[PDB]
Amino acid sequence: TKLADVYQAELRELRLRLDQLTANSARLEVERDNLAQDLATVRQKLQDETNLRLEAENNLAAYRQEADEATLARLDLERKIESLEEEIRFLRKIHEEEVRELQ
Amino acid sequence: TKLADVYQAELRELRLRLDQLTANSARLEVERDNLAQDLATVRQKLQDETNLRLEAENNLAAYRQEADEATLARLDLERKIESLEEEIRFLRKIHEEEVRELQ
Amino acid sequence: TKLADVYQAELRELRLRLDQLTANSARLEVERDNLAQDLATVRQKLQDETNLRLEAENNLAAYRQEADEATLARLDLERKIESLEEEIRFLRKIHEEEVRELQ
Amino acid sequence: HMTKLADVYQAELRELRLRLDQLTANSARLEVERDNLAQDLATVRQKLQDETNLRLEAENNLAAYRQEADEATLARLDLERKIESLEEEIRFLRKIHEEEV
């Protein structure tokens, strides 16, 4: 009986440990399955957002050129205006002087 | 003797299973740790790629708006130019006339 | 005459502006040439550093697996050690019992 | 009198104005190109700094994983010897016990 008790003691311990490990393993498998599903989703969200970023960044260079050329055209015209208003003022001074000389 | 033999057999089996289950559990914990790490990583990449997308889209919007402002300003200026050129023509005509009369 | 002065004044202003603009344009040409050379340099450095970053990031997953497998192997052995020490303890208990039963 | 002079002066004025219009246009264009090159230079310098930081973190994690593998392997080797020692001990215990009966 003492022999049987020694054996049963070791058996009982091993069965206890085994039951705890099976429980722990089942819980870990559930958590792993969940993390994997969420990882698949967020990877898809990343791919989508990368594609949108990429298209936007591609359009940028052409739009920057459009803006530069439009701004350059505006400036050219503002300068022509300044030139014409300068020309007018000069004409009036020159004209006023010429009419004084004919008196 | 038959009894000890049944016990030693079960003892050997349980130790075999236990070693496999411990290995399996260790592996699962490693897999779970990895999935969690990668999930944190890709979530960060998603956030980054969203921020870059938004900034790109904003720069696109800004370049379109600037061009529009430049084009509208240009058109307004072209009309002021036509006005100034008319004014110049009228000034020369009036002055050429005044010059003829004073002679 | 005053008329000649009016004309010479406008001429003087235009010439000075032209001189100022030519000087500024020469400066700007130099600065543009420099910015372009440096831009080419830093673009090359960027490409190089991107290639290294990319290869490092690619090797990451493989090195993490190497570490995981090495750690898993270690654990398997530490467990086999515990198994053998348990077996020893049990053998001594069983042996002591058998020795008592056989006087 | 002034007619001769006015003609010469108006001609030079016309030339200078034409030149100013061309040079002002060119300068404006150069200013735009310089502003752009500077902007892009700032951009790519930032990308370089970012890419360097990512490279360094990656290389650090590589280094750390290589250290983990080396230490784990060394521990494994030490354990395999302890295993041999324990198996030797077991065999000695069984032979000594079998003798004692």
Q: How many whole angstroms separate alpha carbon D79 and alpha carbon C83?
A: 13
Give me the domains of chain B, ranges plus CATH numbers.
1-103 (1.20.5.1160)
Q: How many whole angstroms separate alpha carbon A45 and alpha carbon B34?
A: 20
Q: How many whole angstroms separate alpha carbon C58 and alpha carbon D62?
A: 10
Handedness of CA C68, C73, C74, C75 (dihedral sign): positive
Q: What are phi and psi of C102, to 5 degrees?
A: -95, 25
A96 in contact with chain B, both atoms CB, cutoff 8 A: no
Interface contact flag, B19 C79, Cβ < 8 Å: yes
A13 in contact with chain B, both atoms CB, cutoff 8 A: no
DSSP 8-class letter at C1: -
Q: How many whole angstroms separate alpha carbon D21 and alpha carbon A75?
A: 11
Q: How many whole angstroms separate alpha carbon C90 and alpha carbon C97?
A: 11
Q: How many whole angstroms separate alpha carbon B85 and alpha carbon B91?
A: 10
Q: Name chain C contacts of A98, Cβ cutoff 8 Å.
A: 3
Which residue in D has a C-alpha nearest to residue C66's C-alpha? Answer: D69
Handedness of CA A93, A96, A98, A100 (dihedral sign): negative
> Quick one: tokens of D36?
């752009």
What is the SS3 string spanning chain B? CHHHHHHHHHHHHHHHHHHHHHHHHHHHHHHHHHHHHHHHHHHHHHHHHHHHHHHHHHHHHHHHHHHHHHHHHHHHHHHHHHHHHHHHHHHHHHHHHHHHHCC
* DSSP assignment string, D6-75: HHHHHHHHHHHHHHHHHHHHHHHHHHHHHHHHHHHHHHHHHHHHHHHHHHHHHHHHHHHHHHHHHHHHHH
What is the SS3 string spanning C9-77? HHHHHHHHHHHHHHHHHHHHHHHHHHHHHHHHHHHHHHHHHHHHHHHHHHHHHHHHHHHHHHHHHHHHH
> Quick one: tokens of B28?
């699962």
Q: How many whole angstroms separate alpha carbon A21 and alpha carbon C42?
A: 57
* DSSP assignment string, A53-89: HHHHHHHHHHHHHHHHHHHHHHHHHHHHHHHHHHHHH
Are the beta carbons of D30 and A75 closer than 8 angstroms? no
